[PDB]
Ligand binder design. Sequence first.
Ligand code: ZN
Ligand code: ZN
Lengths: 49, 49, 49, 66, 1648
Amino acid sequence: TIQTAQRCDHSDSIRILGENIKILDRSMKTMMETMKLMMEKVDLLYAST
Amino acid sequence: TIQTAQRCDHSDSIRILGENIKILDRSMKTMMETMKLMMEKVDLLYAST
Amino acid sequence: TIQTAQRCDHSDSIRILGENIKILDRSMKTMMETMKLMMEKVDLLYAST
Amino acid sequence: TIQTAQRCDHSDSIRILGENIKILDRSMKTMMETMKLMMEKVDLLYASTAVGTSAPMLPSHPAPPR
Amino acid sequence: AGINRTDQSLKNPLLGTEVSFCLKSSSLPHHVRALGQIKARNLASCDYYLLFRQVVLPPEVYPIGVLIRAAEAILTVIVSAWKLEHMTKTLYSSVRYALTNPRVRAQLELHIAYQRIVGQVSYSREADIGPKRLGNMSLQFVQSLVIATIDTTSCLMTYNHFLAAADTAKSRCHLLIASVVQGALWEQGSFLDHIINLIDTIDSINLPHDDYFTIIKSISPYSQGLVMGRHNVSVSSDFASVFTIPESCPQLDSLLKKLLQLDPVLLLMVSSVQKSWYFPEIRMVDGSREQLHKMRVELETPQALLSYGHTLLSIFRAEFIKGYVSKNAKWPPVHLLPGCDKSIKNARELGRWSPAFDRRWQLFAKVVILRIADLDMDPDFNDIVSDKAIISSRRDWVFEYNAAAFWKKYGERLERPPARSGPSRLVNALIDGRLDNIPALLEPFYRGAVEFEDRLTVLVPKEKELKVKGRFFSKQTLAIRIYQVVAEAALKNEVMPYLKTHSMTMSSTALTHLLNRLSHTITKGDSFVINLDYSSWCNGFRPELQAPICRQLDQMFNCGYFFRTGCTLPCFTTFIIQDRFNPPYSFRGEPVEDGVTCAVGTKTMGEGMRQKLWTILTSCWEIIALREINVTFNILGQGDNQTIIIHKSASQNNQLLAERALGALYKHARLAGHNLKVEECWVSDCLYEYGKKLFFRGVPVPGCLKQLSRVTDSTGELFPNLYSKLACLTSSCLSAAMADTSPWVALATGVCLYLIELYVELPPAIMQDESLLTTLCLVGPSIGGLPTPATLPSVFFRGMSDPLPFQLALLQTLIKTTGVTCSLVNRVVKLRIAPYPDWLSLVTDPTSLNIAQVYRPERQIRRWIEEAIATSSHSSRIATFFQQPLTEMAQLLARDLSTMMPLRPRDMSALFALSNVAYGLSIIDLFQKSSTVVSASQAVHIEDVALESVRYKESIIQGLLDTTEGYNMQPYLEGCTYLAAKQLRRLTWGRDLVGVTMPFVAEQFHPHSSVGAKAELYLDAIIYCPQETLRSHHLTTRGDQPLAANLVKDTLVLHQWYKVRKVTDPHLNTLMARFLLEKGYTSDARPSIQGLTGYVNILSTWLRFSSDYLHSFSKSSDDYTIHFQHVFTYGCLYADSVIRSGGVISTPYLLSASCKTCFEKIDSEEFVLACEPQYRGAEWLITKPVTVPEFDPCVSASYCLGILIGKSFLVDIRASGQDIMEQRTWANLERFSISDMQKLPWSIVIRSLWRFLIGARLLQFEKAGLIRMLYAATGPTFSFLMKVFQDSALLMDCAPLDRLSPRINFHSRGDLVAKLVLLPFINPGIVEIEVSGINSKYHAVSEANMDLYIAAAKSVGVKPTQFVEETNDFTARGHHHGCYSLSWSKSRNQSQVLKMVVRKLKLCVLYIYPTVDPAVALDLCHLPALTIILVLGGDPAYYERLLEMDLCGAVSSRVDIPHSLAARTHKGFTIGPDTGPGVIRLDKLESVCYAHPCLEELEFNAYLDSELVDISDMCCLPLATPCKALFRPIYRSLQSFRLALMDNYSFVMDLILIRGLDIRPHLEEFDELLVVGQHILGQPVLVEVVYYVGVVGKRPVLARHPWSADLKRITVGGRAPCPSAARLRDEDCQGSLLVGLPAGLTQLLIID
Ligand SMILES: [Zn+2]
Ligand SMILES: [Zn+2]
C-alpha cells in the first residue's frame, strides 16, 4: 500500500520533463529568430542580382 | 499522511505543463508560417537567375 | 484520504496531453519535410554560382 | 486500497510521455543540424558577394541569453 | 627639439620611398639639405652594399694589445680556478691568434669605428651632425637620411641602411672570432680560410640587387640539397637541380662543393648563417601588389572546397572522439543522425573505441558532438599586455602616413584630426579602461556583426629577411586581437589535448621519445623523413574549408557563431599597408581601393591569425592522405613547415612508398586549395629539421656560428647603457651554452666581446691598464659588479647553482696567480652594506646579498610606476587591483617570513611564491619589463632619456676612475669559500642563512690519474673507468654504457611536504590557511597531492662512474652537501679537456675530496615562525575564485612499493625489446635513495609483491614473459632489485626468506632473487603458510602519496649490522669433519692447496691478482686473521664482481679498499703471477696418492719460490656456521631435497601448459637438480639421455623411453657424479625416498 503509493507519484520527474519541454520551446524561439536573420541576407541577395 | 499528501501534489504541475505544451504549439505554428514565407522568398532565386 | 489521492491525480488530463504530444510529433514531422524541400532548393541555388 | 493505488499509478504513462519528449528533442536536434547547413551556404554566398564592395556585415545569430 | 635617430640596431625594414621622394620634388626643409650635398654620381638606395663594401681603414689604428693580454689573463684565471690546467695553452692561443690575424683585426677595428659613430650620433638633439670619417668614407647625417661618400660617388640612404651596414660588420666580427675559437677546439682544424674565401666570393658578386639576394636566399637549401644528394642511401633526391647557383656564381659553387668534399657537417654549419651579409631593400610596389593579389585568388572552386571541408570535419570528429574516449573513458555527448551505422551505436553503448574506425572516417558524418565546455570570455593579464601594437579605431589610419606625400601625390590635404582618438598600445587600453568589459566587446563577434569601426588591418613588412618582395605581418584593431586571444586560448586548452597529433607535440616526454626513436632508426634504414613547405600557407586558406569545423567548434562550446565569424570577417575588412611617403587616397575619410596600397576586403585574415585552427586543418588533410594508402606515420607540425615520419613496410621498399606518399599528399593538398610545389618539397633518410635545430644522420649539427653571430636588439625597456649591453651579451652566451654549443667556445667568445664592448665605451685611462681590466672582468653581479660571462656556473651546468663560492674562488685565484693585490680588489668591488635589511630582495633572489648595486640602471620600478598607474587610471580593473600598495604588503609579508628562527631563504621564497602579492608584483613586472611596454615608459619624458644616458655614462666613468677603497674583503678571500660565503651572508644580512650555500665543485673535488695516486687519495674518491682507450673519435660516437588556481594545488603539495617531515607550527598553519582563504579554498583539510648536460653526453657513454666515497660520507643515513649531477658533469668535463687538448684516456681516473670544510652535514631541522603573521590576505587579486570541489608510514610504503614494483615488472613484460633497454619505469623508480630501502622492512614488501602477483592472475603468454625475463638478466627493475639486494643483511633479515632458502637451490644471487620474485606462480607451498599476512587497509594506500611516504620512510628505520660466516680454516693437527669448500661446480682442490699453503706459511696479508678465479678469492677472504689486498689499478669492477657472489659480507670487511685501489705491482706474497719471488704457483701432478689424514687425492702440486714445501702433514680444526659458499640449500638431509624433487617435477609440468614457453632452460635447471638426484639414485646414470617429454590427456608424461609417440625428444648431456656429496648423502634405510614419492619421480628414479 505504502510502496505502491510511492510508485504512483514522482513530482521530480514531472518537473524535469517540464524543464525539458521548456528548453525545446527556447530552441524553437532561437531557430525562428535565426531564420529571420537568414531572411535579411537572402533579401539583400535578391536586391543585389 | 499530510506531508506525503503534499508530496503527492500534482495539480499545479499538470496545468502548467499544459500551458507549456500550448505555447510550444503556438511557437511551432508561427515558425511554420515563417517557413512558408521563407520558401516563398527563396523560390525567387531562379526567377531572378 | 481517498479524496486527497483523487485530488492529486488527473489521469484524463494526462491522456489529453499525450494526444497533444502526438499532434506535436506530427507537426515536427511536417516541419522536417518542408526543411528537406528548402534544403534541396538552397543546394540547387549554391550549385549554380 | 489497491484499487485506489492502481488508479493513482501512472509509471507507464509518465515513461511514455518522457520517451515521446525525447523523440521531440531528437527531431529538433536534426532540424537544428539541417538549419546550420543552410546557414553555411547562405553566409558564404553573401560573403563572396561582399568582397570589393561596401556591404555591411549583417547579423547571423540573435543575441546572447540574459 | 625632439630626440633624433633613436635606434642603435636594426629593428625596421629597409625602405627606399623617402629617398625617391627626396630626389623627386620635395619641399621639406631637411630634404633640400639632403639633396644639396649629393655628388654627380649618386647611387640608388638599394645599392648601399656596393658602397659600404669599399670602406677600408688604415691597418692597426686602435691600440688593443692590452685587451689581448687581459683576455689571456682572464682565461688563465678561469681555467686555473676550475683546476683543469692542461687546457690552459689551448684557450689563450685561440684568442691571441684571433686578435693578431690581420683580417679579423681589420673587421674588429671596423666594428669599433662603426659603433663609435653609432654612439656619437644616436640619441642626440642635433638634427644635422657634420663630417664623420670612416676611413676613406665620409658620413653626413641629415635627420633620418644619411649621405655617404668615398671619392666621387655618393649614396643618399636612410639610417636603417647604415645600421644594417654596422650590423653586418658586427655579425662578421662575431663570425670570425667564433670561427677561430671553434677551429681551435675541434677535431677538424682551422676553417678560417674558408670563411674569408666565402666573404670575398660573396663580396665579388657583381650582379643586380634581386639576383644577388636570390643567391643569398638560396645558398642554404642548395647546400642541404648537396648533402642530401651525396648522403641518401634509400631514397632519391633532385633538390639540388632547382637552384641557379651553378650558372650564376661558379666560385661559390666550387667553394660549396669543396666544403662538401671535406666535411658535410662543416658545410651545414657554414651555410646556415643568413644575416652576416647585407639585407635587401623591399620592392614595396610589386610585393604589395603580389600580396593583395594572393589574398583574393582562387585555385579551387568554393563548391569542391566545402565538400572537402565536410571531409575534414569527419576526421576531426573521429580524432576528437578517439581522444575523449582514450582520456575520459567514455563517449562525449553525441547525437546520432538518421542513417548512422550500427557499429557507432554499439560502440557508443559499450563505451569503447574499435580498432576499425580509423580507416572508416566517412561514418562520422552522422555523429554531431554536443556541448562539452563553455567559452572563457575573460583573458588573463599575461597575454593581454604584450607582443602586439594596435589601432584604436579606423579614423586613425591617417596617422601612419605623411601629409606632404598626400599633397604631392593627390593634390589635396589629408584633413588629419589633432588628437589620435585613443590608445596606440594594449597597456594604454588597460589604463584608459577600454578592456573593462570583455564580453560586451565580444558580443558583436557572437551576433556575427562586428562594428564598422573595428574592421581595419595594417599590413607591416618584416625586418631582417632575405625576400626582396617582402613578407608582411598584421597590425590589428583591439577587438580582433581580443577575439584572437580568446579563440586561440580555447583551442589550446580544450580541443588540442584531445587531438593526438598535436598532443604528442605538446608533451615534452612523448616528443622526446619520438625524436630518440627517429634518431636510432634512420641510420638502420627505416623511418624516412618527408618535409613539406607551404609558401602560401597563411594566404591560401579559404572560408569554405574552415566553415564546417568552425560550426562544430561553435556547437561544442555553447557559443553562437563565434568561431564562424572569423572566416567571413576578411570579406568586410579594409586592408592597408604601412608605407610612409606612399599613402592611399581618402574620399570621405575612408581609404580608396587601388590594388597596390589598399584592398577593401580579402579572403584570408592574414599571417598568424587563426594559427591553431589552421594547424588542425593541415593535420586533418595529411591524415586523410596518408591513411588512404595504408602507412604508419607520425606528423611533426611547425605551422607552415611540416615534417612527416613514415615507417618502412615489409612489402614495399622506401622509394615506391615515398612516391605514393608524395602523390597522395600533393592530391589532398590541392583539394584544400594549398598547392604544393615540387621544387619546395623533398624526402631524405639523412636530414630533417625540428625546433630550429638541424640533425644530420641523427646527430645534431653544431650551431655555434649561427647563434654567436646573431645581433640582438638590446637596451630593453631602458635608455642605452653599458649594463644592458653586457646583460644581453651574457644572456646570449648563456643561451648558446644551453643550446648545445661548447662552454669553452661561448666563454672565450664572451670574454673577447666583453672587452670590445668595454673598448667602445671606456676612456683610454681605464683601457690601457691591464690589471684593472682583469679585475673588472672578474667581479660580476654577485658582489655588485658588471654582468660578466666569466662568473656563471650555469654555462657548464644545467641545474640551480650558487654564484658566490665560485666568485670568491675566482678572486682567490686572481690574487694568488696574477700580480694583483687585494687593495685593487677592494678598489674595484667597493663593497657597501645596506643600513637596513631589505627582505624582498631575499625572497626574490635567495642567493643574493644586502649590498648596493651601483651600476644597475635606475628605474624606480617598485613605487613610481604604481603611483603613475594608480593616478592616471581612469576606469576599473586597475583601481580594484591596486586599491592597496602592493609593495608595502610585500615588505610586510617579507618581515613576517623573516621571523623564521632557522632562516631558510629557499623555503622563505617558496612560501612567498604561494601568495597573491607575488602575482600582483608579477603583473607590475609585465607592466615594466615586456614587449610594447617600452613604448609608454620611454614616451613618458621622451626627451629626458637622452640626458639620462649621458648622466649614467659620466657617473660610470667617474665611478670606475675613483681610487678610494671600500669594505675590506681580505677575510673573505682566504681559506675555504664555503665558510667565507656563509660568513659574508651573515655579515651582510645580520642573521645566519641556512640552505642556500652550495659548495664549488672544483674546490670540493680535485682530479688525478691512477698512475701516481697513493692510498690516502682513495678514502673519499669518485672513480671513472673507460672501457677502451678514448680519443677524439668517441666524442661523437655513442658507446656501450647507458645514459591561475594551480597555486592551490602547489600550496597543498608544499603543505604535505612540510607536514610529512614533522614541522609543526601554529603560525605557519595560520599563514597557509590565510593563503587558502585568499585563493578561495575555504575547506578545512584536504590530504591530496646520469643524464648530465648535453655537451658531455656522448663521451659519458664510454665511462663507468660509481659512488665509492662511503668511507666517510655514505656509510650513515645523515645527508651531506654534495650535488652529484654537478660532480659527474665536472668529471666528464675533465675527460673532455684531456681529449680536446691532444691527450688520450687509457687509464682510469678519480675525483678526490680535497676541502674538508666543504662537506657539511645538513641539519634536517624544523623551522618555527615565531611572530604572528600580519599579512591578513588580499582576495582582490584573483579574479577567478576556485570552488571547494575544484598507521605507521613504513607498512603503507611497503605495500605501495610492492604493488609499484609488481606493476613495473608488468609494464616491463609488456614493453618491447627496444623499450626494456630504456630505464623508464611506471612511477619513476630510479631517483630513489638506497639508505631508506635499508631502513624499510622488506618482508612486508615481499608478501605484498607475492599477493599482487597472485591477485593479477595473468594469462599464459605474460607469465611466460615473466619467467623468461626473470630467468635472464634483463629488465631495469631486475637491476633495481639487485641494487636493493646488494647487501646480504637485507637477505638474512627477511623472516620468510631464511625459512624459504632450504627449499630453493640457487646458482647465483640473481637466481635466488628471481626464484623469490617468481616462486608463487610455480610453487604455492610456502604461499599456503605466508598468505595469512594480508591487510586490506595497506593495499588501499594510493600511489600518489608514495613520494611523501618515502620522505617519511628515511628517518624511522635502522640498518642492520652484517655478519661474517666461516669456511674451512685447516692449520695444525685435528679431526677431519668433511672438508667442504666449493663442492657445487668448481675446482675445489685449487682452493684446498692454496688454503693449506697460506695457513702453513703463516702469512698475515695476501695479494691476489685478478687473473685468479673469483671463488678461490671468496674462500681466501672468508679465512679469518688475513688481510686480502687485491691489485686493481683503478678499476673497481673485479671487487664489485667479487662482492656480488658472496652472501655473508666477509669480502666487505677483510679487504683493505684504498690499498686495493692503490695497488699496481708485486709488493708481498702473491697468488696469480707465473714465476717470481713471493709467488705461489700451481704445478700439475699426473699421479700421486696424497697420503694425508684429511684429504684423499691430489691433482695440483703447489710450488712456491721455485721450491716445493710439504703440505701433506697438516689437518683441520673445528668449524662453525657457514655461508652460502657451502650451499646449505642442498645439505645432508634429503627431505628438503625431496621437497625440491617434489617441486621441480611440479615446476616443469605446470610450465609445459604455459603457452609461448618452450622449456629448454627451465628443463636444464630441472636437469641440474636431477643430477643432484642422480648422485644418490643408485641406478646407472646415462651421460646422454634421449628424455622424451610430452603431454598426454592434460598430464605431462616425461621420461627417457617414449611412453607415447607424441612425446618430444630433448637431448641432455654431461651428467656425471662429480661432487663428493654423493658419498656423503648415502644414508641408511633405503626406500625412505620412495615413501611419499610420486610415481613419475619413481620412474625418474629407476632408470628404464
Ligand atoms: Zn673549500
Ligand atoms: Zn659469504
